[PDB]
Amino acid sequence: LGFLIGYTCLLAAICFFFAFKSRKLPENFNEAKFITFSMLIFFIVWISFIPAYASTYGKFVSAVEVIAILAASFGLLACIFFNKIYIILFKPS
Amino acid sequence: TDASACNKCPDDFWSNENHTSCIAKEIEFLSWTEPFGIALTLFAVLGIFLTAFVLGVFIKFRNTPIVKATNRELSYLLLFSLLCCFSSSLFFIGEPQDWTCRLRQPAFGISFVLCISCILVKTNRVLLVKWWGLNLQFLLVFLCTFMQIVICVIWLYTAPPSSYRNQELEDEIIFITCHEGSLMALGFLIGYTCLLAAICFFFAFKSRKLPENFNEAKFITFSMLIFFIVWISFIPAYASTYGKFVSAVEVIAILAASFGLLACIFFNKIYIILFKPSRNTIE
Ligand SMILES: CC(C)CCC[C@@H](C)[C@H]1CC[C@H]2[C@@H]3CC=C4C[C@@H](O)CC[C@]4(C)[C@H]3CC[C@]12C
Ligand SMILES: C[C@@H](NCCCc1cccc(C(F)(F)F)c1)c1cccc2ccccc12
Ligand SMILES: C[C@@H](NCCCc1cccc(C(F)(F)F)c1)c1cccc2ccccc12
Ligand SMILES: *[C@@H]1O[C@H](CO)[C@@H](O)[C@H](O)[C@H]1NC(C)=O
């Protein structure tokens, strides 16, 4: 499980690097803000739950995982696709 | 030898494994020399070191007019506030003595207000939206800070925090925590800080596209969003921990908020002042 977590964290860091390197692309092709904010949301949510995962081991040890998953993946969705959906529907160009 | 009835062990004491003698319960609490504590205080001191290095950079290149466009004098106050905010994290990791519990939250609160209000006042387009010219921004930020100082002082005078020694969670382990007394004053403190941060976020949200000193108003927005993310994810992370790892989560949130405020907002200037694009600064 530790290696399974570490590989995902490493790919998240590589995602950070790719977002930083893709900073200068035109507006439609530049998603550096959204990628970096998604990765920040994922990392912040999962790091903040470290004491909870390391201390509680009852019913809350799985509720913590559920809320952390539903926060990280929802942050991914909101950061990546929500702005594009808004710019397509609410403010067409 | 011949006991008609075993007598209960006294307070702060517990029976041995074989119920022969009595031993004392344990003073479980977050401290240093722990796999969790040492890394955390290492991160705190690293934050202090980075903040001091950035302050030294701003002092060294103090005459270059890259920094002169954003109230250079106020930047030192911001950096000192960041020092104090980082240092306030070390209060949650120590022994929960009497004085620590009375000050751990107020210290970080005054630090963060002296930080966010200073950022909000820093906006050169809002200073002018005869006591001006020599000190105008300082008084405006000082009123906002002073409001928080007085609410802190009324909370510290009316219902001072106390170092609650709690042993109901574990019968054999004593947990040294901190009690606040009146939670409504702490709620008012947190609400006022959040309102000030939201005001800063709103004021920075309208100037995203203006490249005022390297698109600073966009990174105000980024830092405020990071702060709100951190303190909205701290809510479920806090009301889940039971034990020594409860003063280790608010301190993690403090470190995250301080990092988001410092790096996002100053590294723009730092990566141009001293890095390879050194000959990219201009008036
Ligand atoms: C230092 C690490 C550990 C955390 C801090 C975040 C770093 C990686 C990020 C936050 C915002 C980023 C900056 C965003 C925009 C630009 C403008 C560009 O013209 C030079 C790089 C620069 C200035 C980036 C450098 C990297 C940066 C400072
Ligand atoms: C859902 C989760 N299962 C164990 C959580 C351990 C954990 C608890 C608290 C904090 C952290 C972390 F921050 F260190 F990641 C991990 C999981 C499963 C599979 C892959 C994952 C990749 C990243 C994160 C979680 C992953
Ligand atoms: C550090 C953090 N409070 C710590 C205790 C949390 C708590 C513990 C127990 C009860 C409650 C609550 F019920 F009041 F919410 C909260 C804090 C301190 C100061 C200013 C702040 C401003 C913004 C964000 C956080 C701030
Ligand atoms: C039982 O209690 C403790 C074990 O934790 C031990 O120190 C003590 O000597 C024991 N008493 C006996 C074996 O009589």
Handedness of CA B49, B152, B230, A90 (dihedral sign): negative
Helix (H) or strand (E) holding B151: helix B137-158
The phi and psi torsions of B27 (rounded to 5 degrees) equal -90, 65
- The two structure tokens encoding residue B139: 């008084």
Report the distance separating Cα B8 and Cα B14, nearest Å.
9
* N- to C-terminal Cα separation, chain B: 90
CB B137 within 8 A of CB B153: no
Of A41, A45, A51, the CB nearest to B241: A51
Strands B165-166 and B26-28: unpaired
For B70, which DSSP code? Answer: G
Classify the phi-psi angles of B213: left when phi > 0, otherwise alpha if psi is within -120 to 50, otherwise beta: left
Of B225, B226, B240, the CB nearest to A64: B240
Contact A48 B253 (CB under 8 A): yes
Residues of A in contact with B256 (CB under 8 A): 44, 47-48
- Ligand 4 centroid distance, CA of B15 (Å): 10
- The two structure tokens encoding residue A69: 């998953």
What residue spans of B159-249 are helical by DSSP H? 183-205, 216-238
Report the distance separating Cα B145 and Cα B197, nearest Å.
13
CB burial string B12-27: b at 16+ within 10 A, e below? eeeeeeeeeeeeebee
DSSP 3-state assignment of A59?
coil
Among all ligands shown, which has an atom nearest to the Cα of B214? 1
* N- to C-terminal Cα separation, chain A: 46
Report the distance separating Cα B141 and Cα B113, nearest Å.
9
DSSP 3-state assignment of B174?
strand
Q: Closest ligand 1 atom to the C-alpha of B219?
A: 11
- A-B Cβ pairs (cutoff 8 Å, strict): 55
Distance from CA of B233 to the nearest CA of A (A): 6
For ligand 2, atom 18, the nearest C-alpha belongs to: A5
Can you give the resolution of this entry in Å? 3.1
DSSP 3-state assignment of B231?
helix
Report the distance separating Cα B91 and Cα A38, nearest Å.
31
Report the distance separating Cα B244 and Cα B35, nearest Å.
13
Cα–Cα distances in Å, from B37 out to B33, B84, B93, B258, B281?
6, 20, 7, 18, 41
Residues of A in contact with B92 (CB under 8 A): none
> What would the 3-class secondary structure string for B40-61 be?
HHHHHHHHHHHHHHHHHHHHHC
Edge-to-edge strands, sheet with B26-28: B26-28, B173-176, B165-166
Report the distance separating Cα B66 and Cα B218, nearest Å.
17
Report DSSP letters for B82-108, one per residue. Answer: HHHHHHHGGGTTS---HHHHHHHHHHH
Report the distance separating Cα B81 and Cα B243, nearest Å.
31
Does the C-beta of B262 come closer than 6 Å to ligand 1?
Answer: no
- CA torsion angle A17 B255 B258 B83 (round to 10): -130
Closest CA to A49 of B241, B247, B254, B43: B241
Out of B271, B275, B278, B281, mutate this one to test ligand 1's pocket (max ligand atoms within 8 Å of CB): namely: B271
Instruction: Give Cα A48 distance to the centre of its chain.
Output: 14
Out of A1, A5, A57, A61, mutate this one to test ligand 2's pocket (max ligand atoms within 8 Å of CB): namely: A5
Report the distance separating Cα B266 and Cα B249, nearest Å.
26
- The two structure tokens encoding residue B283: 């008036």
Helix (H) or strand (E) holding B260: helix B250-273
CB B84 within 8 A of CB B107: yes
Residue B152 amino acid letter: C
Report the distance separating Cα B135 and Cα B139, nearest Å.
7
Does the C-beta of A66 come closer than 6 Å to ligand 2?
Answer: no
Nearest CA in chain A to B260: A40
- Ligand 4 centroid distance, CA of B113 (Å): 55
- The two structure tokens encoding residue B157: 């005078």
Residue A89 amino acid letter: L
Handedness of CA B159, B161, B163, B168 (dihedral sign): positive
Report the distance separating Cα A42 and Cα A75, nearest Å.
7
HSE of B240, CA atoms in CB hemisphere, 13 A: 27
- Ligand 2 centroid distance, CA of B245 (Å): 18
Among all ligands shown, which has an atom nearest to the Cα of B14? 4
Residue B56 amino acid letter: G
Helix (H) or strand (E) holding B14: strand B14-15
- The two structure tokens encoding residue B191: 């609400």
DSSP 3-state assignment of B23?
strand
Report the distance separating Cα B237 and Cα A45, nearest Å.
9
Helix (H) or strand (E) holding A11: helix A2-21
